[PDB]
Design an enzyme around this catalytic site. Structure first.
Site, PDB file in Angstrom:
ATOM      1  N   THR A 234      45.744  23.901  38.316  1.00 13.84           N
ATOM      2  CA  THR A 234      44.478  23.291  38.568  1.00 13.84           C
ATOM      3  C   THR A 234      43.509  24.154  37.729  1.00 13.84           C
ATOM      4  OG1 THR A 234      43.458  24.290  40.376  1.00 13.84           O
ATOM      5  CG2 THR A 234      44.909  22.058  40.662  1.00 13.84           C
TER       6      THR A 234
ATOM      7  N   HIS B 279      39.409  27.363  46.699  1.00 15.79           N
ATOM      8  CA  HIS B 279      38.154  26.659  45.767  1.00 15.79           C
ATOM      9  C   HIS B 279      37.082  26.036  46.728  1.00 15.79           C
ATOM     10  CE1 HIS B 279      41.037  26.411  42.336  1.00 15.79           C
ATOM     11  NE2 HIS B 279      41.984  26.282  43.308  1.00 15.79           N
TER      12      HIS B 279
ATOM     13  N   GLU C  81      39.834  20.420  46.081  1.00 15.91           N
ATOM     14  CA  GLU C  81      40.552  19.703  44.719  1.00 15.91           C
ATOM     15  C   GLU C  81      41.011  18.433  44.979  1.00 15.91           C
ATOM     16  OE1 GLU C  81      42.366  23.411  42.754  1.00 15.91           O
ATOM     17  OE2 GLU C  81      40.225  23.171  41.611  1.00 15.91           O
TER      18      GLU C  81
ATOM     19  N   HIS D 253      36.768  33.566  38.331  1.00  8.80           N
ATOM     20  CA  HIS D 253      36.838  32.009  38.761  1.00  8.80           C
ATOM     21  C   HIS D 253      36.977  31.866  40.197  1.00  8.80           C
ATOM     22  CE1 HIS D 253      37.507  31.717  34.470  1.00  8.80           C
ATOM     23  NE2 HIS D 253      38.423  32.506  34.525  1.00  8.80           N
TER      24      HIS D 253
ATOM     25  N   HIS E 299      44.481  32.033  46.991  1.00  7.79           N
ATOM     26  CA  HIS E 299      42.923  31.942  46.607  1.00  7.79           C
ATOM     27  C   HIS E 299      42.548  30.432  47.334  1.00  7.79           C
ATOM     28  CE1 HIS E 299      45.088  29.630  43.562  1.00  7.79           C
ATOM     29  NE2 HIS E 299      44.150  28.825  43.613  1.00  7.79           N
TER      30      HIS E 299
HETATM   31  N1  LIG Z   1      44.941  26.466  41.344  1.00  8.94           N
HETATM   32  S1  LIG Z   1      46.424  26.600  41.532  1.00  8.94           S
HETATM   33  O1  LIG Z   1      46.885  25.481  40.741  1.00  8.94           O
HETATM   34  O2  LIG Z   1      46.810  26.993  42.633  1.00  8.94           O
HETATM   35  C1  LIG Z   1      46.632  28.027  40.471  1.00  8.94           C
HETATM   36  N2  LIG Z   1      47.402  29.055  40.615  1.00  8.94           N
HETATM   37  C2  LIG Z   1      47.344  29.831  39.403  1.00  8.94           C
HETATM   38  C3  LIG Z   1      48.162  30.883  39.147  1.00  8.94           C
HETATM   39  C4  LIG Z   1      47.922  31.332  37.823  1.00  8.94           C
HETATM   40  C5  LIG Z   1      46.962  30.615  36.857  1.00  8.94           C
HETATM   41  C6  LIG Z   1      46.557  29.308  37.021  1.00  8.94           C
HETATM   42  C7  LIG Z   1      46.854  29.041  38.433  1.00  8.94           C
HETATM   43  N3  LIG Z   1      46.148  27.990  38.939  1.00  8.94           N
HETATM   44 ZN   LIG Z   2      43.676  26.954  43.255  1.00  8.31          ZN
END
Ligand SMILES: NS(=O)(=O)c1nc2ccccc2[nH]1
Ligand SMILES: [Zn+2]
Length: 257
Positions: free
Chosen positions: A195, A93, A103, A61, A91
């Site tokens: 997200t 996007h 996002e 992903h 990470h």
């Molecule tokens: N894109 S996030 O909201 O930062 C995010 N972190 C995550 C860690 C584990 C599983 C789903 C996730 N989604």
């Molecule tokens: Zn994220």
């Protein structure tokens, strides 16, 4: 299971993760005229002097840069938060082209990419327990625009050729996430969710107003990664972002006037 394609992308997630249509989903559009400056918000405290990076992983992903979160080495405190949140991974996007990828959006503007520094509330002991709680996570979101290179990003881009496909990982020690931050810690904050699946509603979002700049070459290298596994038909890892979700009954607060 889920992904970012036409057949398994964000419009499909609700079938396996019904909370996708919940009351506190992320990301959201930040309407800069509607967000209210809240003079009771504190300065954020980003304490990354002792951050211990370990490994970088293509998870099919995105790629995650993972930290030692077995003690309080890299923590986020202050701002809208009560208590101490330990950095576990970051990470990004990003888009297929520079006009999309983030996002969160700002007055409907999409940035080329968005960095998420994910942290979990130490009062719940471990990440898997924290994601079950409405105040379990704090995610620091930082927008990327394309212009000048970001020197502190180059060590990440340099390793991506070694983790091209799903399930590949590489040693990634001694990386200093302080070199991804913009100058200002002014931010917007609102209650929301992960997200990606499982889309849990456990995040205090803190999104910095000031984007960092990265170069075209740097983001091109993100777009050479693959969603697929080794030897499988190549599917470039691009457009791994979820679009803005309804704000519903939420207020976005600004730390700055
Ligand atoms: N894109 S996030 O909201 O930062 C995010 N972190 C995550 C860690 C584990 C599983 C789903 C996730 N989604
Ligand atoms: Zn994220």
């Amino acid at each position: 299971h889920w992904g970012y394609g036409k057949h398994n992308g964000p419009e499909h997630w609700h079938k396996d993760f019904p909370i996708a249509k919940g009351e506190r989903q992320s990301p959201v559009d930040i309407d800069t005229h509607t967000a209210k400056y809240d003079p009771s918000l504190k300065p954020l405290s980003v304490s990354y002097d002792q951050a211990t990076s370990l490994r970088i992983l293509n998870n099919g992903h995105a790629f995650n840069v993972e930290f030692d979160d077995s003690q309080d080495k890299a923590v986020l405190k202050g701002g809208p938060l009560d208590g101490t949140y330990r950095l576990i991974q970051f990470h990004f996007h990003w888009g297929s082209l520079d006009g999309q990828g983030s996002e969160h959006t700002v007055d409907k503007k999409k940035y080329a990419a968005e960095l998420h520094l994910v942290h979990w509330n130490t009062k719940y002991g471990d990440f898997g327990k924290a994601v079950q709680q409405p105040d379990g996570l704090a995610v620091l979101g930082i927008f990327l625009k394309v212009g000048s290179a970001k020197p502190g990003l180059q060590k990440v881009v340099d390793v991506l050729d070694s983790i091209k496909t799903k399930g590949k990982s590489a040693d990634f020690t001694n990386f200093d996430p302080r070199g991804l931050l913009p100058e200002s810690l002014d931010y917007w904050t609102y209650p929301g969710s992960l997200t990606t699946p499982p889309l849990l509603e456990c995040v205090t979002w803190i999104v910095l107003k000031e984007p960092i700049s990265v170069s075209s070459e740097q983001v091109l290298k993100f777009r050479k990664l693959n969603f697929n596994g080794e030897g499988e038909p190549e599917e470039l890892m691009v457009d791994n972002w979820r679009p803005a979700q309804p704000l519903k009954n939420r207020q976005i607060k600004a730390s700055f006037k």
